[PDB]
Amino acid sequence: LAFAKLYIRDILDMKESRQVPGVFLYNGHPIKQVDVLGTVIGVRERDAFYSYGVDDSTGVINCICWKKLQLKKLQETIEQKTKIEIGDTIRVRGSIRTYREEREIHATTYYKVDDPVWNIQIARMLELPTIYRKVYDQPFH
Amino acid sequence: MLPKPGTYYLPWEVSAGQVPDGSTLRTFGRLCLYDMIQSRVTLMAQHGSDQHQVLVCTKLVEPFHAQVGSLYIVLGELQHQQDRGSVVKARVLTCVEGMNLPLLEQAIREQRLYKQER
């Protein structure tokens, strides 16, 4: 029901449920929607979407981020050249998908994180072991 | 076509030659040298109770806008040289002044211990 905060390494290797495709299993926990944070290490642009290779220090995964659509004057030309690039930090909330034998995240939401003193990323690094200990590593229900 | 993940290593682990040739890594330190002509950066860190150097090659992160004297986190691949020091070939070089360094280091430790405890 939530966007599950997980290591990219677990996303990459959780077994898929045969009974309910698109649902993945971590210790008997049914995982679909995830929340990842990491460094952009690759950018590929297509007509309808961006592919952002995201590295969270445990693994690297492609996140497919669908393109959208004063407004063109104040914002758009500024949006134009603040685009996500290699080296940026991004947060991606979406679903785990398999496509052409590769695992991917299909984004429901994605944004560049301003993290100038590594505050958000340190907090994430510190929080994850706790969510695993309290929830994911505990018997499902 | 994705690279391997930038695994966290403490800089004195990189310094002491504990990261195998060709590994992909994140490390950190204070930027103490930038020479654009030779595309070289040196990151420095103190640890009980010596100074430790991490050699970085900046070719892929040029044009590099240096904050010499500031803390950085580098993401890249470690490469043996013939035969000076091992160098990190940066793919990302990020200024993080004033990150809470000891908190970073604790987060790295907790992450490793969790992985080990699993």
Residue numbers in the entry:
A (entry chain A): 24 to 92, 112 to 183
B (entry chain D): 2 to 119
Text of the article:
Like the scCST, the hCST (Ctc1, hStn1 and hTen1) complex is predicted to contain multiple OB-folds and it binds telomeric overhangs with high affinity and some specificity. Overall, hCST plays a role in telomere replication, and may also have a more general role under conditions of replicative stress. To further elucidate the role of hCST at the telomeres, we solved the structures of hTen1 in complex with the N-terminal domain of hStn1 (hStn1N), and the C-terminal domain of hStn1 (hStn1C) alone. These structures reveal that hStn1-Ten1 is a RPA-like complex and a structural homologue of Schizosaccharomyces pombe Stn1Ten1 (spStn1Ten1) and Candida tropicalis Stn1Ten1 (ctStn1Ten1).
A search in the PDB database using the Dali server shows that the structure of the hStn1N-Ten1 complex is strikingly similar to the S. pombe and C. tropicalis Stn1-Ten1 telomeric complexes with an RMSD of 2.1 Å and 2.9 Å respectively, indicating significant structural conservation of these telomeric complexes between humans and spStn1Ten1 and ctStn1Ten1. We observed that the hStn1-Ten1 complex has striking structural similarities to both spStn1-Ten1 and ctStn1-Ten1. This close structural relationship indicates that they likely carry out a conserved function at telomeres. Many of the conserved residues making contacts between hStn1N and hTen1 are located on the C-terminal helices and the β-barrels of these proteins. To determine the role of hStn1-Ten1 complex assembly in telomere function we designed single and double mutants of conserved residues required for hStn1-Ten1 heterodimerization. Functional assays of hStn1 mutants defective for hTen1 binding show telomere signal-free ends, longer and fragile telomeres, phenotypes associated with telomere length deregulation and a dysfunctional scCST complex. DNA binding assays reveal that hStn1 shows a robust ssDNA binding activity while hTen1 binds ssDNA at a non-appreciable level (≥15 µM). Interestingly, the hStn1-Ten1 complex exhibited non-specific ssDNA binding activity but with an affinity lower than that observed for hStn1 alone. The OB fold of RPA32 (hStn1 homologue) is a DNA binding domain that is involved in the 30 nucleotide binding mode of RPA, and helps the complex to achieve its 0.1 nM binding affinity for ssDNA while RPA14 (hTen1 homologue) is not involved in high-affinity DNA binding. It's possible then that hTen1 carries out primarily a structural role in hCST assembly thus enhancing Ctc1 and hStn1 DNA binding via promoting the proper assembly of the trimeric CST complex.
